[PDB]
Write a protein that binds this ligand. Structure first.
Ligand SMILES: Nc1ccn([C@H]2C[C@H](O)[C@@H](COP(=O)(O)OP(=O)(O)OP(=O)(O)O)O2)c(=O)n1
Ligand SMILES: OC[C@H]1O[C@@](CO)(O[C@H]2O[C@H](CO)[C@@H](O)[C@H](O)[C@H]2O)[C@@H](O)[C@@H]1O
Length: 580
DNA sequence: GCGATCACGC
DNA sequence: ACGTGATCGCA
């Protein structure tokens, strides 16, 4: 049964009521400088569809959009806000975002359209976007009557569902998490994405050219050492060269054949000179394909900026993710890849990049949640936590901790945060399951509060059905009750890890909100460009560095109050590389 | 188009 | 743990 609405030819006052469900539809997945294909408004006066060329040229409509006192309920308001920013139009007054609400209620539903959210509350009078638009090469905006009905049904769904979603959030003690954390964050992310990050494309191109030359040289050395040309990027053609023509040992298998992962190759290197060259080839090829070529493909040729999209409603722990480009995995560990960061530069003359990162926030969060006396004391002393962990688990003085001991203790600390298992620690350290289990036992002997936490959190997940973070983010773990050991064990590790990873996410999100407020209060021109889980990257005039050196770490350190201090390191420089 | 594999970040 | 995405190769 069709849904009634006015297919409007002009904007009227009744469309500009002080509460409405608003749809500002951007069908392109990447909404940067993208078309708005249609607008729907549902409010106390009825249901309306507006052509965007009409609405967005209308001064009254534009003023309504930008009026903070005119409240709008939406789904994925960031998409609309950014698309409107590209058109020089400010969207304000978004009081409810159904995407974020659905995400907080259950991130596992993978809600990514209104229909999916609606189905959570048995509301089915709206089509999935994929049904309307199609996907891939077949994707298209449909004719107006079909488009208009869809946008109106989405607006109608939002109008109906706001209350039951808010009611459930309130029951879960998550309504503040939506209204005071995620919704304000969405506006901040919209700003960051719209600002973009300036790229030194000539530098990337120069690196591209040098990598191409190095790739050619290593490629040829590989064919030489193999006495044969083949496709090095096929883990199957490669597996044949290595494990058949050259007869190398099969140390590890995949599901469909031989492993050629770097950890395996590193083990095979002593047998044949080809292996180190395959590794080198892989390193260079990663830089060339993913970073150089990948960045260059998405840089805007006019402004030479990249404009990531931070997916705020994807990860199961409350982290953001970043796409097109992913600016959360730019290399740093290896110097060769780290130089990619030299191409990320400030957007204005005489500005600098300022980067601030939490030091060991996940382990500090663990100390807090677990109330582990030893771990808390370690952070209260600002100890090197890996050296301290080695001291405790290997029962030596600080002076007796060797580099290998620190390395193994560090791995244990990661294992503990990730949700410890002897098999997984064993794989990481290239040791036996029994040896890994002894390490873990020693760790829990030294950190008995952490042990009690890991036990208790798994029991709580079983009892309640979910675990929660500091600011009341939730993750359901139905597999915690599985009688399949492997399935259950993965859920147990999620129980252990999610409050840690997710509370750290909560903290940095709050820090972003607090920081933006302080930046505005101080009228600094500095602004956020990126978040990389435990770090914030800003740019600012060079004249603001001294103020940022004090302000940014303070705001980040004070975002929450834990049983241990939070510590933030910071650096600045003329490129992201130099902000070290 | 999509799954397997691999490698980059935290 | 939690992510994105490149290439291959088989649809
Ligand atoms: N109705 C509520 C109550 C709490 N919280 C979240 C956000 C708060 O910052 C955090 C802490 O709650 P309390 O301060 O009440 O403890 O939990 C929430 O989202 N909604
Ligand atoms: O706008 C981001 C928001 O949209 C969703 C779908 O609702 O993801 C879409 O947009 C992403 C960014 O372009 C794409 O990566 C994704 O493939 C696309 O579905 C949400 O997941 C996201 O929060």
């Amino acid at each position: 049964a069709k849904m009634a609405f006015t297919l409007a030819d002009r904007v009227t006052e009744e469309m500009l009521a002080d509460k409405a469900a608003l749809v500002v539809e951007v069908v392109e997945e990447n909404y940067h400088d993208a078309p708005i294909v249609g607008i729907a408004v549902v409010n106390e006066h009825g249901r309306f569809f507006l052509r965007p060329e009409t609405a967005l040229a209308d001064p009254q409509f534009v003023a309504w959009l930008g009026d903070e006192t005119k409240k709008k309920s939406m789904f994925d308001s960031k998409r609309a806000a950014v698309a409107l920013k590209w058109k020089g139009i400010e969207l304000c007054g978004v009081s409810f975002d159904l995407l974020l609400a659905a995400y907080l209620l259950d991130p596992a539903q993978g809600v990514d359209d209104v229909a999916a959210a609606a189905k959570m509350k048995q509301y089915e009078a709206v089509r999935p976007d994929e049904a309307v638009y199609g996907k891939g090469a077949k994707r298209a905006v449909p004719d107006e009557p079909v488009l208009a009905e869809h946008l109106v049904r989405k607006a109608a769904a939002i109008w109906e569902l706001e209350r039951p979603f808010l009611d459930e959030l309130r029951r879960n003690e998550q309504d503040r998490l939506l209204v005071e954390l995620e919704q304000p964050l969405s506006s901040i992310l919209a700003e960051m994405e719209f600002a973009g990050v300036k790229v030194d494309t000539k530098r990337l191109e120069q690196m591209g050219k040098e990598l191409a030359e190095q790739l050619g040289t290593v490629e040829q050395r590989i064919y030489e050492l193999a006495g044969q040309e083949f496709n090095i990027n096929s883990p199957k053609q490669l597996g044949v060269i290595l494990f058949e023509k050259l007869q190398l040992p099969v140390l590890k298998k995949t599901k469909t054949g031989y492993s050629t992962s770097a950890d395996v190759l590193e083990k095979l290197a002593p047998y044949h000179e080809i292996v180190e060259n395959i590794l080198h080839y892989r390193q260079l090829g990663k830089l060339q394909s993913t970073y150089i070529e990948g960045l260059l493909k998405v840089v805007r040729p006019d402004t030479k900026k990249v404009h990531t999209i931070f997916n705020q409603a994807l990860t199961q722990t409350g982290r953001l993710s970043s796409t097109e480009p992913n600016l959360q995995n730019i290399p740093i560990r290896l110097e060769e890849g780290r130089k990619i960061r030299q191409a990320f530069v400030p957007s204005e003359s005489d500005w600098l990049i300022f980067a601030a990162d939490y030091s060991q926030i996940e382990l500090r969060v663990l100390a807090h949640i677990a109330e582990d006396d030893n771990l808390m004391e370690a952070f209260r002393r600002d100890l090197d936590i890996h050296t301290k962990t080695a001291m405790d688990i290997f029962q030596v003085s600080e002076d007796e901790v060797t580099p290998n001991m620190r390395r193994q203790a560090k791995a244990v600390n990661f294992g503990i945060v990730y949700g410890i298992s002897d098999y997984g620690l064993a794989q990481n350290l290239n040791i036996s399951r029994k040896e890994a289990a002894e390490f873990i036992e020693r760790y829990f002997e030294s950190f008995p509060g952490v042990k009690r936490y890991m036990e208790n959190i798994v029991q709580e997940a079983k009892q309640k059905g979910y675990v929660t973070t500091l600011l009341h983010r939730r993750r359901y773990l139905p597999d915690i009750t599985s009688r399949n050991f492997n399935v259950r064990s993965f859920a147990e590790r999620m129980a252990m890890n999610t409050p840690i990873q997710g509370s750290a996410a909560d903290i940095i999100k709050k820090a972003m909100i607090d920081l933006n407020a302080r930046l505005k209060e101080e009228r600094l021109q500095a602004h956020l460009l990126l978040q990389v889980h435990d770090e914030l990257i800003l740019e600012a005039p060079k004249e603001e560095m001294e103020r940022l050196c004090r302000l940014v770490p303070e705001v980040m350190e004070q975002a929450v109050t834990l049983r241990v201090p939070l510590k933030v390191d910071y650096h600045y420089g003329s490129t992201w590389y130099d902000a070290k």
